[PDB]
Design a protein around this ligand. Structure first.
Ligand SMILES: O=C(O)Cc1cc(I)c(Oc2ccc(O)c(I)c2)c(I)c1
Ligand SMILES: [As]
Ligand SMILES: [As]
Length: 253
């Protein structure tokens, strides 16, 4: 219990326990496996026509929702590759995924922010600008993600960190309706821990790194909630036909 609480008070910044490494291995695997087209510096993006997205620019909105079912599936793939997840009742596995889906999606899109072209890359293919994503039906949610991506520039995260982060967003035991609420906090904490340890081991040269990286979990949660509201404004504004099936089931909450 306090082998940590004490080891801390001393000043020791504990690396990950042999077992935690196994857990980190699992999560970094599952992430990279359910990821985009790879992930590197210098060319790949398919810059979205500049005349797209400039109410709701239905032209853009289409492009997005077009490649939205793939993204939503990779999130479910990731969650599938985490044993702890599988250990949960199908009911809960659905409440969890529907909750953290946009959160993990905003994260992935945010960590693909290119400061040069000032664009994110959705599904690792389509590049979009702030106003393109904004006018394509996300509104102020675009500024949220773009502002995040810019901020995450400095944390210079890696797959494992972005992989763990997603696991923390996933085991949010506060989702309404959860049945096995305890067994979920146990797993999230298990993660937050292997996560904190991994950050010590990596030792970034940023003061208060961890406290700052947890403040991101909150911002991601806020992008999530803000999206739910934007989904309403989208239902009413855009048609009822341009809404992929999966996309729809996942977001009626
Ligand atoms: O990049 C990835 O893998 C994940 C990802 C994929 C997409 I498409 C995306 O844009 C959205 C999401 C919801 C929505 O209602 C609309 I309109 C656009 C974002 I932000 C992130
Ligand atoms: As909002
Ligand atoms: As906001």
């Amino acid at each position: 219990a306090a082998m940590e609480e004490l080891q801390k008070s001393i000043g020791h910044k504990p690396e990950p326990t042999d077992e935690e490494w196994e857990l980190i291995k699992t999560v970094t695997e599952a992430h990279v496996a359910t990821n985009a087209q790879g992930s590197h510096w210098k060319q790949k993006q398919k810059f979205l026509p500049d005349d797209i997205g400039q109410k709701v620019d239905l032209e853009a909105f289409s492009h997005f929702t077009k490649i939205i079912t793939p993204a939503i599936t990779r999130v479910v793939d990731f969650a599938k590759k985490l044993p702890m997840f599988c250990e949960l009742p199908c009911e809960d596995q659905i409440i969890l995924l529907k909750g953290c889906c946009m959160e993990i999606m905003s994260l992935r899109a945010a960590v693909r922010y290119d400061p040069e072209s000032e664009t994110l890359t959705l599904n690792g293919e389509m590049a979009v600008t702030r106003g393109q994503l904004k006018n394509g039906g996300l509104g102020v949610v675009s500024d949220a993600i773009f502002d995040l991506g810019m901020s995450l520039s400095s944390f210079n995260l890696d797959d494992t960190e972005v992989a763990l982060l997603q696991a923390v967003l996933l085991m949010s035991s506060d989702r309404p309706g959860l049945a096995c609420v305890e067994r979920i906090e146990k797993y999230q904490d298990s993660f937050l821990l292997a996560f904190e340890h991994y950050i010590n081991y990596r030792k970034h040269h940023v003061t208060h790194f961890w406290p700052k990286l947890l403040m991101k979990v909150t911002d991601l949660r806020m992008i999530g909630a803000c999206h739910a509201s934007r989904f309403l404004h989208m239902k009413v504004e855009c048609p009822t036909e341009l809404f992929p099936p999966l996309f729809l089931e996942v977001f009626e909450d």
